[PDB]
Amino acid sequence: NREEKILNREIGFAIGMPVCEFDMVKDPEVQDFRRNILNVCKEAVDLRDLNSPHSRAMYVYPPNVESSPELPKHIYNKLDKGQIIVVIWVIVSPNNDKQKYTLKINHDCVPEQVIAEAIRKKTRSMLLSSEQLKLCVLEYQGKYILKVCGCDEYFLEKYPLSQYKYIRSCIMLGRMPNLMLMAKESLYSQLPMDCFTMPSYSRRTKSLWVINSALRIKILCATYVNVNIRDIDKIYVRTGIYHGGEPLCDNVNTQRVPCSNPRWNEWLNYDIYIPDLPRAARLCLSICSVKGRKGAKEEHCPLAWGNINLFDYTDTLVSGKMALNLWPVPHGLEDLLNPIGVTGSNPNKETPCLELEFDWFSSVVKFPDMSVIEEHANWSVSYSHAGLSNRLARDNELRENDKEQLKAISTRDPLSEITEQEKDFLWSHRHYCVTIPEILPKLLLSVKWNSRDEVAQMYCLVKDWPPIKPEQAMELLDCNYPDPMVRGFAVRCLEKYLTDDKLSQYLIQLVQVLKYEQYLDNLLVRFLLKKALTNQRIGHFFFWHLKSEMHNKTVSQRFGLLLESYCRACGMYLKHLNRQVEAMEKLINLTDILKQEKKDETQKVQMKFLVEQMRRPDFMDALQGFLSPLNPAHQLGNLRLEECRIMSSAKRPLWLNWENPDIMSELLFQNNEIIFKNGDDLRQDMLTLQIIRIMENIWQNQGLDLRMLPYGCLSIGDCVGLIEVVRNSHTIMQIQCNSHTLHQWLKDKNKGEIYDAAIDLFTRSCAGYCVATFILGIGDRHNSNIMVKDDGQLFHIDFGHFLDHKKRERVPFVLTQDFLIVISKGAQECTKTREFERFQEMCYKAYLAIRQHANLFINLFSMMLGSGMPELQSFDDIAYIRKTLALDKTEQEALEYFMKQMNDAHHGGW
């Protein structure tokens, strides 16, 4: 009633469009999705109310843990005899006195064991309780919970203390962990119980295989096809039947008609049997122009494109009259068709519009049930009769060379081209493939999707297919794998083997591949929403990754509806997301005014305006007392306007400073510094920074302490976003204030016995960033986009473009004598040193480690193909890292290559 209205108003502000606009959408798929997705909402809420309050605190404050408890060789070695020193703080009776208790405990100690040990140290003063009954009422560890001093991170689950990301970091960085003992009932009360309500909208035949006919589609007429008559001669419609990025038959064009009258009334006949149409078959079309000639070949140009699914969300083969509002052709489209393009009708109806008719076979035609599929697969299942086609291998036919040949095929990278000889081979030996389940993505590409008999066989193999690694399953979710039985299996592996640490790690890819789903209601959307609604850390980024694309009409309906369902069931977080949403709004409206009206003024004038505009009551209210969209465990107190400045950088970003309202702010950072950028697409920087974190985690799990700085970066909208500020760090140029200038500065900041640890950090971070940038083909490095910390850690900022920004593999990070003098610790011939010898083997061991995990990076890039990212628009883009990692070459041939690239850029040494 009145409360539904408030909520409707609250969701409307969060997603950026009124809920009422979803109610007017006549599409049954839309209204069904809104109503039918509500069971995920119910289930998620029920799980939160299972063991209240704890159950609800786990949702709000989930454990920030690593996937594996096992501490690597070098990490366990930082512990003194396998024991970690921790500092526990108690806020005692006001004037809120902070009292510390320093403890030495095993790294595998559970938080409850730590609370007891802290109470044991605290009570030690009263020696009466020390000897007699050391217990102290079971040391009431159920009356207290651990919190991270300085931020809203809690230790609520029975995990070894070292498995917690904060504690593992503290071990690696040589920092003492400061924890705060906070009474259980004080957190539990701060949590308002959820009152999830069901919305008002929540109330409201023949089989395909019996149609012994060829497919046909009628192409009627086109409107809103406004064309300069003087240029174009004729216009025709190019059409094709696809399954993902692969055609099921040959592409059929209509007759050419004068552009003044786009009227065809033609029935287009295709090279495909109707029972032979796979589930994910789609019609792909475009309106093309043709003018010439100069006595040469005809100048074909695609005007606008569109794709329709041959079957609707209810498995119904689309029948009857239709209208498709076409889409503009994106720059550099090498084809007349756009199969990898978004499927569906353009929301703007003032765009070219193709009117079609599909066949009507006297009744509602539907895709057969699995019972009919299995009964046509068991129905599918001599010496010279099993050998009349290279797609059948009988019993007593499996060779030991074949077993190793299939094994060799499985090793090959995702972009490694399977030959047609190799496809017939994988298909004939499909039943052995179950022994090495990792072969599935290659085997699935060996299927002739245009054959019902072949596809039905594949469907049965997928049914009883051994689950694969979560990282391995993610490929089966890219554009290449449209089939629901395939994608459903991939979701099933993630549903089972994917940790919440890894879901947070790969969330952007998982949000992206959603655009490759045929329907609004699928197993991926349900998987992701459930995780978003049972973990508020995942939930936060699901919301922001989806909100940041609401300006993109290609996805705004899917995403809008997904955000509607999310906002109804997230609970209290909605009020906090709304605060962030309003904060970001005010920074966009303000940075817009500066860019449009005041760009041509002095820093002094611009700052005067900034300060005046920020001091306004409506502004001050919105921009203080909210959670950092970058890390929502960060409270952003009051603005420190005296520390807020417009940066001299390009797009003139705002450096913003907030107080940290935590009582233990001083034990983390007393002030939160975020950079607000308006003007650049922050999406490439999110992907690079994600890849850097992954490369770093790989090296750290092999015994390579090559420290990276994957700083926070979050795209919050259309070329607007947030950048984390790396505290106490300076660019190479702001160190030059000769050749020893850098080494001089580092040696100065790190004087004494702290010098030998600061040198190692430079050389190790340098080796990591040197290997990372080469492989990735990041934008060329200079004195301004290389930064150094007052401890020794080197890192890069502003990545620009990845892969081939040129359009024949570069070394973007070339080492100046400065960096090499720090490595060789002042040495004259920095080439022939014992220090550079230890640095060479760092770069070599780093490069080979990434080579081993090539298939993950290739996959993480392919999932991101859906994104409008100009440097990631084709599989020919991702192809770059297949060159840098020398995947065709051997492990020794690849090492020689890396040395040659470094040598032909640094002019020797290696």
Ligand X SMILES: CC(C)n1nc(-c2ccc3oc(N)nc3c2)c2c(N)ncnc21
Contact residues for ligand X, defined by CB under 6 A: 649, 653, 675, 677, 685, 711, 723-726, 729, 731, 797-798
Closest CA to 188 of 217, 213, 154: 154
CB 338 within 8 A of CB 305: yes
Q: Which is nearer to ligand X, 211 or 675 (CB)?
A: 675
Q: Which is nearer to ligand X, 735 or 858 (CB)?
A: 735
Q: Which is nearer to ligand X, 675 or 905 (CB)?
A: 675
**What is the nearest approach in angstroms of ligand X to the Cβ of residue 794?**
13
**What is the nearest approach in angstroms of ligand X to the Cβ of residue 632?**
19
Q: Which is nearer to ligand X, 479 or 778 (CB)?
A: 778
∠ CA 61-710-159, nearest 5°, is 35
- H or E segment to which residue 221 belongs: strand 214-223
What span, in angstroms and rounded, lies between the C-alpha atoms of 180 and 186? 13
Q: Is residue 294 exposed (0-12), middle (13-18) or buried (19+ Cβ within 10 Å)?
A: exposed
**What is the nearest approach in angstroms of ligand X to the Cβ of residue 636?**
17
H/E/C letters for each residue in 330-393? CCCCCCCCCCCCCCCCCCCCCCCEEEEEECCCCCCEECCCHHHHHCCCCCCCCCCCCCCCCCCC
**What is the nearest approach in angstroms of ligand X to the Cβ of residue 609?**
21
Q: Work out the number of other CB atoms within 10 angstroms of the CB of residue 225.
A: 20
What span, in angstroms and rounded, lies between the C-alpha atoms of 112 and 157? 9
**What is the nearest approach in angstroms of ligand X to the Cβ of residue 603?**
14
**What is the nearest approach in angstroms of ligand X to the Cβ of residue 502?**
25
Q: Which is nearer to ligand X, 238 or 652 (CB)?
A: 652
Closest CA to 148 of 190, 101, 182, 107: 182
CB 346 within 8 A of CB 871: no
Q: Which is nearer to ligand X, 531 or 677 (CB)?
A: 677
Q: Which is nearer to ligand X, 38 or 692 (CB)?
A: 692
**What is the nearest approach in angstroms of ligand X to the Cβ of residue 688?**
9
Q: Which is nearer to ligand X, 486 or 682 (CB)?
A: 682
What span, in angstroms and rounded, lies between the C-alpha atoms of 522 and 514? 9
User: Which residues, listed in sequence order, are joined to residue 182 by a DSSP beta bridge?
Assistant: 145
> Which residue in the block uniquely carries the two structure tokens 């060329």?
780
What span, in angstroms and rounded, lies between the C-alpha atoms of 223 and 261? 9
**What is the nearest approach in angstroms of ligand X to the Cβ of residue 696?**
17
Listed in sequence order, the residues at least 6 apart from 375 whose beta carbon sits closer than 8 Å to its beta carbon are none
Q: Which is nearer to ligand X, 449 or 711 (CB)?
A: 711
Q: Work out the number of other CB atoms within 10 angstroms of the CB of residue 387.
A: 13
**What is the nearest approach in angstroms of ligand X to the Cβ of residue 649?**
6
Listed in sequence order, the residues at least 6 apart from 18 whose beta carbon sits closer than 8 Å to its beta carbon are 8, 12
Q: Which is nearer to ligand X, 217 or 722 (CB)?
A: 722
**Residue 331's Cα: distance from chain center in Å?**
25
Q: Which is nearer to ligand X, 588 or 887 (CB)?
A: 588
**What is the nearest approach in angstroms of ligand X to the Cβ of residue 157?**
32
Closest CA to 814 of 756, 871, 766, 759: 766
Q: How far is CA 773 from CA 121, 269, 909, in A?
A: 49, 51, 19
**What is the nearest approach in angstroms of ligand X to the Cβ of residue 795?**
9
What span, in angstroms and rounded, lies between the C-alpha atoms of 749 and 767? 21
CB 445 within 8 A of CB 424: no
H/E/C letters for each residue in 56-77? HHHHHCCCCECCCCCCCHHHHC
**What is the nearest approach in angstroms of ligand X to the Cβ of residue 711?**
5
Q: Which is nearer to ligand X, 467 or 712 (CB)?
A: 712
Q: Using the 8-state DSSP alphabet, how is residue 316 labeled?
A: B
- The two tokens of residue 480 are 């290449």
Q: At what angle do helices 741-749 and 755-776 cross, to 10 degrees?
A: 130
What span, in angstroms and rounded, lies between the C-alpha atoms of 204 and 33? 12
What span, in angstroms and rounded, lies between the C-alpha atoms of 241 and 652? 48
Q: Which is nearer to ligand X, 265 or 784 (CB)?
A: 784
**What is the nearest approach in angstroms of ligand X to the Cβ of residue 796?**
9
Phi and psi at residue 552, to the nearest 5°: -95, 95
Q: Using the 8-state DSSP alphabet, how is residue 513 labeled?
A: G
**What is the nearest approach in angstroms of ligand X to the Cβ of residue 689?**
8
Q: Which is nearer to ligand X, 450 or 729 (CB)?
A: 729
Q: Which is nearer to ligand X, 113 or 731 (CB)?
A: 731
**What is the nearest approach in angstroms of ligand X to the Cβ of residue 713?**
6
**What is the nearest approach in angstroms of ligand X to the Cβ of residue 732?**
10
Number of H helices, E strands in the chain: 33, 27
DSSP secondary structure of 718-764: SSEEEEE--SSEEEGGGT----SHHHHHHHHHS-STTHHHHHHHHHH
CB 364 within 8 A of CB 206: yes
**What is the nearest approach in angstroms of ligand X to the Cβ of residue 630?**
11
**What is the nearest approach in angstroms of ligand X to the Cβ of residue 683?**
10
Q: Work out the number of other CB atoms within 10 angstroms of the CB of residue 718.
A: 14
Q: Which is nearer to ligand X, 233 or 871 (CB)?
A: 871
Q: Which is nearer to ligand X, 423 or 789 (CB)?
A: 789
Q: Which is nearer to ligand X, 625 or 712 (CB)?
A: 712
